[PDB]
């Protein structure tokens, strides 16, 4: 699927290595993010919330994209598809930017370990 494919292209990792990382990557989220990669996911959730408030269904939207030397190019028939691509693009770029502190120990992080307050969007 789309976001997964973008994650793989931009990070060199498998999609599943971001699908359940930390306290925010993967469905829902609560408490304080564990690291910068997790912050990308906190922000991505916020981005999807903004799209939902605009009338989009970002968990369901399918979009088009290409990756060249110039970056990620988003596309789609509808504005909601293009918005979803923009949210994903920002998160995939955030993942790449933070590859230096990605830690395998936060993949499949048990949710009971998430503590502290929940940052606002
Ligand atoms: Ca999440
Ligand atoms: Cl951090
Ligand atoms: Cl965002
Ligand atoms: Cl491509
Ligand atoms: Cl880009
Ligand atoms: Cl590691
Ligand atoms: Cl790794
Ligand atoms: Na429109």
Q: Quote the tokens at residue 40.
A: 């990308």
85 and 74 Cβ atoms separated by less than 8 Å? yes
For 74, the token pair is 């988003």
Residue 44 a catalytic site member:
yes
- Cα separation, 80 vs 54, whole angstroms: 9
Task: Provide the token pair at 20.
Answer: 């359940």
**Tokens matching residue 13:** 């990792």
Structure token digits, residue 90 = 């920002």
CB proximity list for 40: less than 8 A, separation 6 or greater = 25, 91, 94, 95, 98
State the binding site for Ca(2+): 20, 22, 24, 26, 28, 45, 109, 111
Backbone phi, psi, residue 64, to 5°? -115, 145
Contact 21, 38 (CB under 8 A): yes
Q: In units of Å, what resolution does this entry have?
A: 2.0
> Which technique was the structure solved with, according to the deposited record?
X-ray
Paired tokens of 11: 């990070």
Please confirm, yes or no, whether 35 is among the known catalytic residues.
no
Distance 76 CA to ligand 1 centre (A): 24
């Amino acid at each position: 699927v789309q976001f997964g494919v973008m994650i793989e292209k931009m990070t060199g990792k498998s999609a599943l290595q971001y699908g359940d990382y930390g306290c925010y990557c993967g469905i829902g989220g609560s408490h304080w993010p564990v690291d910068q990669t997790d912050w990308c996911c906190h922000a991505h959730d916020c981005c999807y919330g903004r799209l939902e408030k605009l009338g989009c269904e970002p968990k369901l939207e399918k979009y088009l994209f290409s990756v060249s030397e110039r970056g990620i190019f988003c596309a789609g028939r509808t504005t909601c598809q293009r918005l979803t691509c923009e949210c994903d693009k920002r998160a995939a770029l955030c993942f790449r930017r933070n590859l230096g502190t990605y830690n395998r120990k936060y993949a499949h992080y048990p949710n009971k370990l998430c503590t502290g307050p929940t940052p606002p969007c």
